[PDB]
Design a protein around this ligand. Structure first.
Ligand SMILES: Nc1ncnc2c1ncn2[C@@H]1O[C@H](COP(=O)(O)OP(=O)(O)OP(=O)(O)O)[C@@H](O)[C@H]1O
Ligand SMILES: Nc1ncnc2c1ncn2[C@@H]1O[C@H](COP(=O)(O)OP(=O)(O)OP(=O)(O)O)[C@@H](O)[C@H]1O
Ligand SMILES: [Mg+2]
Ligand SMILES: [Mg+2]
Lengths: 405, 70, 108, 51, 395
C-alpha cells in the first residue's frame, strides 16, 4: 500500500477572496468616451456573442440528462437533505479527506467534484452528505460576533473640521492613514512605502481619540477599534489568540485601519481575572510585536495606537518598522483653547454677557476634554433652568463642577 | 438560429347517422329521420331499439351488406 | 516544417507549389499518418500573418481528400490570420468547434 | 359524531409517525435553505417546507 | 461625448450578454461551497458515492496473534466504541502497526486503509506556504551573520554531498539574537524565501495554551509533522515567550510554559534522534533563555545581530534608498555617520521620512536636506522611544 499524493501544492485555501469570479472582464482603457474605448467594448461584445452562440449550441445538442438545470438538480440529489455540518480535519488527497462531525467522530470520506476544492483548508466548516458523510460543500462561515465587535459599522460624525489646533498632528496622521489610500501615486513615485505605524501620545483629553474618530470619518478602509485593556483575557494564551484574530480580521477586510486605543492600559492595569500575571501580558505583547512587524506578510493594514502613558510601553513595541511615527498631542495653547471653545459652542446659543476669553484661562492645564465638559455641563445647567440661552453664570457653575469637586 | 451578427460583418347542428346507428339514450329524444326519406318508423323514433320501417315507395331495396365477425 | 520556417510569412511560390504537390501526391491512407499534418503547417508557415492571400491556396486545397482537407484548410487559414484578432475568423473556428463527432473525422 | 370517530381512528396511525426534531435557526440561505442546530446533534443545512 | 450613447448601448449589451452567459453556464451559490459547473463530474461523483464506501477513523491498539494467519486487531473508533476486527483482503498485514490511525468500514469495522497521524490544524497552518518577498540582498551589514546562518540552515540542504563525504555533521540549530529592529526576522524571512524544504514559522506566543500540557502537545505534534518530511526548517520567532529559564518561585510561576520549553528541548536533543529538522530561533532577549535551550545540540550557532557599523549602516541606507527618487549627490556615508548606534529599522524610517518630507513639500525628488531632517526627526527626535539603549544590555 502507498499513501495518496495530492496534486495541489500546500494545504491552505486560495488567498484571493471575494473576487469578480467569471465576470472579470478585461479593463478597457481609456475611460474617456473615445472610439478606441468603443472599439475595445465592441471586441468584448463580439467575443461574448461568439461565446453565447457556442454555449447555446452545445446545450442544444447536449442530452436531456446533461442540462444546466438538470445538472443542478442532480447536484442537489447527490448532496441530499439534510446536509450535515462537519469540520475539515485533514485533506488526505484531492478527492479524499478526513472530516469530523459535530459528535466528535471522524470519517475518511470522499470530496465530490462539485465541491469548491480551493475553499478547503483544515478546520474549515464543510457540508457532508447525511448518509455517506462525503464532502458535498463548504459552508461560508458567518461573521464572528467578535468581527462585528471590532468593525466600526457607521463612520463617526466627528470630522477634521471639528478638531482645533492639531494641524501638525492631523497632517502627520493623514500622511500615514489617509494619503496612502487616496493618493498612493505620491508614495509610488517617491519609491517609499508609507510610514508603517502611528502612535498618538499625550496628556489625557488632548484629542488622540478625537483624531482617530476624524480619521475613521474620512477613511475608505475598514476601521477596527480595540481598547488595550480588552487584550487582557481571563485564560492563558487567550490574549495572544485575541491579538492574532484581531489582525487576521484586519487582513480579511483589507484595506483596514487598526486602532489600538489606550494600549498602555494592557500593562498599567492588573486584574485578578488574568490567570497569568505580568508574564501572560508579556506574551500578549510579544504576539502584538509579531503582528505589527513579524514573519507573516502584512497586507494593507494600518495600525494607530493611542496612550497617555507612553513611558510605560515596551520600547520594542513602538520601535520603527512597527510604529514609524510618534505624534505628540500637547495641552492646548490659548489660540487652540479659543478654537476649541468656538468649536464646542458653535451649535450653542450663547448669551451676550458670556465671553470665551475669560473661560480660556479657567485652568492652566486646560485640555479639549475639559472645555467640552465645561460646555456640556453649562448646557445642562441651562436645561435645569428650562433655558435655551446659556448665561455666564451657567459657565461659572460649569467650571466649579467639572474642574473641581 | 443562425450565427450572431458581429461588429464587423362552424360545427353543424345535426349529424346523419347511418344504419345501424349508435344512438345514445339521450340522443333518442333528439333524433328524427329526414321527412323526405322513403322509410317511416312505426313507433316513435325516440323509443329506440329495433324499429321496423314502413316503405312509402317500391323502388330497388338498397339494403345493408352484413359484415363478418373478427 | 523547415521550408515553412525559412519562408515564414513570405508567401513563397516555390514552397507553396511543392507543398501542394507533396500533399496531393500522397494517398488517402498515407494522409492518415499524423506526420502529414506537418505538410500544411509549413504551408501555413509560408503565409503566416498574410491574411487574405490564402484564397488561391484554399481553392487548391479543396481538391484534397477528406478529412485531411479540413485539417489542412483550418491550419493554413489560421496561420494566415495569425496574430490579427479577426473576430470573423474566430467565429468560423468556433463554428468548426461547435459540431462534435462521436477523433478521425474530428482532427481539425 | 362520525367525524370524531374517524379522527380518533386516524389518530392511532398519526401518533406512530415519528416526532420532529427541535432546532435553532442560525441563518437563512439561498434556495430556501436554513442553517439549524439540532438540540444535541450539531448543525444541519435543511430544506424548507412549501407551507 | 459623441460616442457616449453608443458606449452605454454596447455596455448594457455586454452586461446583458454576461448575465445571459451566466444563465446557461453557472456561477451562482458560492455560499454552500459549490465549484463552477465546468468542474462537475457528476457521473464520477455518483460512481464514487456508490462504490467508494465511507470509512470511520479508528486507532489500532493491539495486534493479537500477529505471527499466525489469523491476526486480530483491537481498534478504538474515536468516541464511538472499541472493536476486535481483522484486516481487509486488500491490506497487507505488515502495513498496519500498533498505535497508528486506520480507517475501517461501518459494517464489520475491518481495517481498510492506514491513515496519517492526527495533527492539530493550528500546527498544520504553522508551515509556510507563501514564501516572503525578502532575499538576502535586502539585508545589509550582516555579511558574516548571513554566511554563518546560510552554512547551517541552507547549505546542508542544498548540497549535502559536501558534508557526508568528510564524515561531517553540520549544526542543526541557530539562534539569531540582537536588539529590536536589527534584522533577525528579516533574515528569517530571507531564509524562508530561499529555502526549498518545508519551512514552519512558530511564534512563541502561539505555543501558550489555555490548558495544562497543551503547549507541549503542540510542540510534540510540530516535531512529528516536521519529521514527515525529508528535510525541514522550523523558525521560532520570539522564543523568549516560552523559552525562559526555569525557576521556582514558591507558587506555580510559569510551570506550564516551562513544561512546553522542556518538551521543545527534549524534541531538539533527547533520547530519540531529532531527525533532519534544522531549527531557527530569533529573540531580542537571549539573556532570559534557559541554559539547556542555549546549549549546543539545541542551539549550536549563536549569531549576534549587533547594530550595524558605519559600513553596515551605509549598506542599509543604499538598500532602502535604492528605489528612492533621491538627488544626485546624497552623501549616504555622512548620513550613516550621523546615526552611530541605529538599527536598520531606524535607517528605513529615515529613508521613508526623507521621502515624506519631499512629498509634503510637493517635490518629486528628495534632496540631501530632506535626509538630514529625516535623521533629525527619527534618530534624534524619536530617540526618547528608542528600544536600543535598553536592549543591548539584554544582548
Ligand atoms: N484639540 C481639540 N479640539 C477640539 N475638540 C477637542 C480637542 N481635544 C479634545 N477635544 C474634545 O474632547 C473630547 C474628548 O477628548 P478625547 O477622548 O479625544 O481625548 P484623548 O486625548 O484621546 O483622551 P484619553 O487619553 O482620555 O483617551 C473629544 O470628543 C473632543 O470633542
Ligand atoms: N540589516 C538590515 N538590512 C536592511 N534592512 C534591515 C536590516 N535590519 C533591519 N532592517 C529593516 O528594519 C525592519 C526591522 O524588522 P525586523 O523583522 O528585521 O526586526 P527584528 O530584528 O526581528 O526585531 P524584533 O526583535 O523587534 O522582532 C526590517 O523589516 C527591515 O526593513
Ligand atoms: Mg481616548
Ligand atoms: Mg522580529
Amino acid at each position: 500500500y502507498e499513501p495518496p499524493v495530492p496534486t495541489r501544492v500546500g494545504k491552505k485555501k486560495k488567498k484571493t477572496k471575494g473576487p469578480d469570479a467569471a465576470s472579470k472582464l478585461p479593463l478597457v482603457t481609456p475611460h474617456t468616451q473615445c472610439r478606441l474605448k468603443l472599439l475595445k467594448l465592441e471586441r468584448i461584445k463580439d467575443y461574448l456573442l461568439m461565446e453565447e452562440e457556442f454555449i447555446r449550441n452545445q446545450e442544444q445538442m447536449k442530452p436531456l440528462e446533461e442540462k444546466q438545470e438538470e445538472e443542478r438538480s442532480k447536484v442537489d440529489d447527490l448532496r441530499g437533505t439534510p446536509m450535515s455540518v462537519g469540520t475539515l480535519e485533514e485533506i488526505i488527497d484531492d478527492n479524499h479527506a478526513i472530516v469530523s462531525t459535530s459528535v466528535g467522530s471522524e470519517h475518511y470520506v470522499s470530496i465530490l467534484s462539485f465541491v469548491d476544492k480551493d475553499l478547503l483548508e483544515p478546520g474549515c466548516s464543510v457540508l457532508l452528505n447525511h448518509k455517506v458523510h462525503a464532502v458535498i460543500g463548504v459552508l461560508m462561515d458567518d461573521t464572528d460576533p467578535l468581527v462585528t465587535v471590532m468593525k466600526v459599522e457607521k463612520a463617526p460624525q466627528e470630522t477634521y473640521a471639528d478638531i482645533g489646533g492639531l494641524d501638525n498632528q492631523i497632517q502627520e496622521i493623514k500622511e500615514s492613514v489617509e494619503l496612502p489610500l487616496t493618493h498612493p501615486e505620491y508614495y509610488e513615485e517617491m519609491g517609499i512605502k508609507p510610514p508603517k505605524g502611528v502612535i498618538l501620545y499625550g496628556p489625557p483629553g488632548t484629542g488622540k481619540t478625537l483624531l482617530a474618530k476624524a480619521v475613521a470619518n474620512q477613511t475608505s478602509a475598514t476601521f477596527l477599534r480595540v481598547v488595550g485593556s480588552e487584550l487582557i483575557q481571563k485564560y492563558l494564551g487567550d490574549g495572544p489568540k485575541l491579538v492574532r484574530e484581531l489582525f487576521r480580521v484586519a487582513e480579511e477586510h483589507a484595506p483596514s485601519i487598526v486602532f489600538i486605543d489606550e494600549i498602555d492600559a494592557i500593562g498599567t492595569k492588573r486584574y485578578d481575572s488574568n490567570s497569568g500575571g505580568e508574564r501572560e501580558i508579556q506574551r500578549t505583547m510579544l504576539e502584538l510585536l509579531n503582528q505589527l512587524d513579524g514573519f507573516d506578510s502584512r497586507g494593507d493594514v494600518k495600525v494607530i495606537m493611542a496612550t497617555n502613558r507612553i513611558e510605560t510601553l515596551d520600547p520594542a513595541l513602538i520601535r520603527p518598522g512597527r510604529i514609524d511615527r510618534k505624534i505628540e498631542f500637547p495641552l492646548p495653547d490659548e489660540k487652540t483653547k479659543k478654537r476649541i471653545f468656538q468649536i464646542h459652542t458653535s451649535r450653542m446659543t450663547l448669551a451676550d454677557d458670556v465671553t470665551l476669553d475669560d473661560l480660556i484661562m479657567a485652568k492652566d492645564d486646560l485640555s479639549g476634554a475639559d472645555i467640552k465638559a465645561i460646555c456640556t455641563e453649562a448646557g445642562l445647567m441651562a436645561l435645569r433652568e428650562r433655558r435655551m440661552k446659556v448665561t455666564n453664570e451657567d459657565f461659572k457653575k460649569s467650571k466649579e463642577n467639572v474642574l473641581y469637586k | 438560429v443562425s450565427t450572431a451578427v458581429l461588429s464587423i460583418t362552424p360545427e353543424p347542428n345535426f349529424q346523419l347517422l347511418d344504419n345501424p346507428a349508435r344512438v345514445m339514450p339521450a340522443q333518442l329524444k333528439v333524433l328524427t329521420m329526414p321527412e323526405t326519406c322513403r322509410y317511416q318508423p312505426f313507433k316513435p323514433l325516440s323509443i329506440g331499439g329495433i324499429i321496423i320501417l314502413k316503405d312509402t315507395s317500391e323502388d330497388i331495396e338498397e339494403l345493408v351488406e352484413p359484415v363478418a365477425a373478427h | 516544417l523547415a521550408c515553412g520556417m525559412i519562408a515564414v510569412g513570405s508567401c513563397n511560390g516555390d514552397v507553396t507549389s511543392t507543398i501542394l504537390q507533396t500533399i496531393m501526391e500522397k494517398s488517402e491512407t498515407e494522409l492518415k499518418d499524423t506526420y502529414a499534418r506537418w505538410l500544411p503547417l509549413g504551408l501555413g508557415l509560408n503565409h503566416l500573418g498574410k491574411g487574405e492571400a490564402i484564397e488561391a491556396i484554399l481553392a487548391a486545397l479543396e481538391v484534397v481528400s477528406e478529412p485531411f482537407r479540413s485539417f489542412a484548410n483550418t491550419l493554413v487559414d489560421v496561420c494566415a490570420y495569425a496574430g490579427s484578432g479577426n473576430v470573423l475568423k474566430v467565429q468560423q473556428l468556433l463554428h468548426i468547434c461547435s459540431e462534435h463527432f462521436d477523433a478521425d473525422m474530428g482532427a481539425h | 359524531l362520525n367525524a370524531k370517530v374517524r379522527l380518533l381512528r386516524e389518530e392511532l396511525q398519526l401518533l406512530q409517525e415519528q416526532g420532529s426534531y427541535v432546532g435553532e435557526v442560525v441563518r437563512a440561505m439561498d434556495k430556501k435553505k436554513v442553517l439549524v442546530k439540532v438540540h444535541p446533534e450539531g448543525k444541519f443545512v435543511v430544506d424548507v417546507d412549501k407551507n | 461625448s459623441t460616442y457616449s450613447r453608443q458606449i452605454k448601448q454596447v455596455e448594457d449589451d455586454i452586461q446583458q450578454l454576461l448575465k445571459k452567459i451566466n444563465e446557461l453556464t453557472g456561477i451562482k451559490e458560492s455560499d454552500t461551497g459549490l465549484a463552477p459547473p465546468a468542474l462537475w463530474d457528476l457521473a464520477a461523483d455518483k460512481q464514487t458515492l456508490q462504490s467508494e464506501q465511507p470509512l470511520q477513523v479508528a486507532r489500532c491498539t493491539k495486534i493479537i496473534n500477529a505471527d499466525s494467519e489469523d491476526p486480530k486487531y483491537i481498534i478504538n473508533v474515536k468516541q464511538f466504541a472499541k472493536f476486535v476486527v481483522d484486516l481487509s483482503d486488500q491490506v497487507a498485514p505488515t502495513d498496519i502497526e500498533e498505535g497508528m490511525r486506520v480507517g475501517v468500514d461501518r459494517n464489520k469495522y475491518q481495517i481498510h486503509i492506514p491513515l496519517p497521524p492526527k495533527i492539530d490544524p493550528t500546527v498544520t497552518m504553522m508551515q509556510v506556504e507563501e514564501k516572503p518577498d525578502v532575499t538576502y540582498s535586502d539585508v545589509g551589514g550582516c555579511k558574516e551573520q548571513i554566511e554563518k546562518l546560510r552554512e547551517v540552515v541552507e547549505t546542508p540542504l542544498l548540497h549535502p554531498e559536501r558534508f557526508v563525504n568528510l564524515g561531517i555533521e553540520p549544526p542543526k540549530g541557530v539562534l539569531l539574537f540582537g536588539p529590536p529592529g536589527t534584522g533577525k526576522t528579516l533574515c528569517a524571512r530571507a531564509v524562508a524565501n530561499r529555502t526549498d524544504a518545508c519551512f514552519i514559522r512558530v511564534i512563541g506566543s502561539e505555543l501558550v495554551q489555555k490548558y495544562v500540557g497543551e503547549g507541549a502537545r503542540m510542540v510534540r505534534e510540530l516535531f512529528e509533522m516536521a519529521r514527515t518530511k525529508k528535510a525541514c526548517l522550523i523558525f521560532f520567532d520570539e522564543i523568549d515567550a516560552i523559552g525562559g529559564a526555569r525557576f521556582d518561585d514558591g507558587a506555580g510561576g510559569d510551570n506550564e510554559v516551562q513544561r512546553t520549553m522542556l518538551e521543545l528541548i527534549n524534541q531538539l536533543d533527547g533520547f530519540d534522534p531529532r531527525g533532519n529538522i534544522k531549527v531557527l530561533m530569533a529573540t531580542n532577549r537571549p539573556d532570559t533563555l534557559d541554559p539547556a535551550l542555549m546549549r549546543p545540540g539545541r542551539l549550536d550557532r549563536k549569531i549576534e545581530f549587533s547594530l550595524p557599523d558605519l559600513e553596515g549602516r551605509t549598506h542599509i541606507f543604499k538598500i532602502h534608498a535604492r528605489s528612492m527618487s533621491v538627488e544626485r549627490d546624497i552623501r549616504f556615508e555622512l548620513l550613516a555617520r550621523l546615526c552611530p548606534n541605529s538599527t536598520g529599522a531606524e535607517i528605513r524610517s529615515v529613508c521613508t521620512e526623507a521621502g515624506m518630507f519631499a512629498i509634503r513639500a510637493r517635490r518629486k525628488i528628495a534632496t540631501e536636506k530632506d535626509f538630514l531632517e529625516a535623521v533629525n526627526k527619527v534618530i534624534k527626535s524619536y530617540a526618547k522611544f528608542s528600544a536600543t539603549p535598553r536592549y543591548m544590555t539584554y544582548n
